[PDB]
Each structure stands twice: as structure tokens, then as C-alpha cells.
Amino acid sequence: EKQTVKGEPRFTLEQQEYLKAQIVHLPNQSEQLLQCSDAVLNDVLIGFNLNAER
Amino acid sequence: IKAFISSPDNRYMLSLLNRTLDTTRQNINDFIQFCCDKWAKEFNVKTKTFFGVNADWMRLVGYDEISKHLNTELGKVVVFSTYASMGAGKNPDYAVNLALEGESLISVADVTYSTQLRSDIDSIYLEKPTQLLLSDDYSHTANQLCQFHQILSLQENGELSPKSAENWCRQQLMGMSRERSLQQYHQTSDYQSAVRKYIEQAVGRAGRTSLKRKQI
């Protein structure tokens, strides 16, 4: 975000988004789940027909 | 401790030990306390004592509590900790308070101007590292595997003759104690280098800023 070359910002706003969306962090299985939200899990469950299962 | 209090330009001392001085040794703690006070009454100064610096106090109380006391009040601070605990968390620093300043901090850098101003440790005491032999707590067979790994590894490089290796392995198979395992590793040459490594790392982490005192 804050790297400058010769007194001018090195990266424009749109370029920063592309570079910042290419890095992934991989936590535990038990911390990846509690980080999610109700909407995400509900969307996945209805998208694969898993709610009907007992 | 007595040497540290009788100093003009020092207000921070950290004693690295091998055991935690928590409530399980409460009595011993109290014994030191009134001693410090006695010395603190000889040379007119008020000293701060910090006890129980473990992993359950740096993540449940906050280490910043120490730092604040060095930029909001006058006094010397003595903190007790261990080798392993101080290996985690990093950067035990307080920034500045020129009103509370000990009339001199010499800048050490040549071409820099720091956005803020910070300093680091100026007095440390080092004990003898102990329990320098790896062990495992998971299950009972894994510990055996670890021990045999280390014995054979020492045999390969050239520190142990075959005759000694067989004796150590035989007694481990029959059964020994930790305190008899530690007495045969001390006779080799790897122990010396390991101790030196510990000292070098513990001292190297004790400096991270460019504001320093004169006498350390």
C-alpha cells in the first residue's frame, strides 16, 4: 500500500487490488469454520442439496 | 540485584532463569521482596518488582503494562523470566519520556531520523541453561524413538565411540532415568556448542533500537 519511488506512489489504486487478491493464508480446520458466516454455509447447503440429510 | 540498584543511569534489569517464580514458590518470592526494600531504603530510590512473567501473563494481562511504567513514572524495574518464555513475543521496548529522562540517551545511528524514539535493555543476568536433551510427551513409544535417534546421530558424526553407544542403548532398552541420561551427554563436545548457541541468541535478541545508554 505505502511504497513510493522518487516521491511518487509506486502503485495505483486498481493495481493494488489485483496484487492484494493473489495471496492466501491457510488456518486450521477448526478456525476456518468459525470464521465463516451463516449466509455462506446456508448458501452452500442449499446449493448442494445437503439440508434434507438427517 | 544489589549491584543494579546502586547505579545512577540504569532503570531496567531482566533476570533470565530456568524456572518460573510463580506462586508455587511464593515464600521464596517474599524473602527476596523485603530484601530489595531494605536495599531500596539504603540508596534513596523506589524500585518496581515484576513476578510471574509466563505465557499465561503475556496473553492474559499484557506486556505493555511494563512499558508504560517506564514512560509515565520514575523508578527502576526488575523483572523475572525464563529462557523459553522470553523466546516468544519479541520487542520488550518502552519508547521515551523526556521529563522522566535520565539526563542522557546517546543516539547511535549516523544517517537516520526515527519517526518515534525507542530504547531497549541495559542490564541482564545469565544463568546456566539446563535440560539440554530432547524429549517427547505424546505417547510413550515416541519418546523411545526420539532418544534412539539422538544416540545414533551422535555416533555417526564422531563424538561417540561404538563401545559407548552400545552401552547407552542397552541401558535405555532396559530402562533408565532422565537424570542419568543427562550425565552422559555432558561428556561429549556438542553440549559446549549448544550452550554457546543459547547464550548468543539470548544476547542478540536484547537489542533492537538505536537509542542506547553509555555503560551497559
Add this chain to the structure above:
Amino acid sequence: MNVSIEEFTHFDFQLVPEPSPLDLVITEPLKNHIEVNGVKSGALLPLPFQTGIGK
């Protein structure tokens, strides 16, 4: 929004920030590694650095 590589259509790739004593030591051995036994070959490089200076 989904950005694309077309944003970098015209970009400056041959200008880099001014070097430091600690990046030449990283770069030059690797360049000597590609010349001989190169193209496809690994390299183990232990760098002895110090806390403080910007490792």
C-alpha cells in the same frame, strides 16, 4: 469487482527501487547458479542475518 491483467498493459518493468547491501548478496549467487548447472536445479542458501537491520 474483478480486475484484469489488461490493467498492466502499459507498465514500467525495468525500474526498481535503489538497492541495499543485503539484496545484492541474495541476487548474485543465484545468477551464478543459473549459468552452470542451471535451468532446472535447486539451491540451499543459508543467510546469516541479525535482528535489528531489516531482515
Add this chain to the structure above:
DNA sequence: TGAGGAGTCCAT
């Protein structure tokens, strides 16, 4: 007679 302790990941 021989030595003397805390700190950690992850899938079940």
C-alpha cells in the same frame, strides 16, 4: 551417585 523445566503445533 546421577541431576533438577516451560512451550508448542493438528486432527480426531
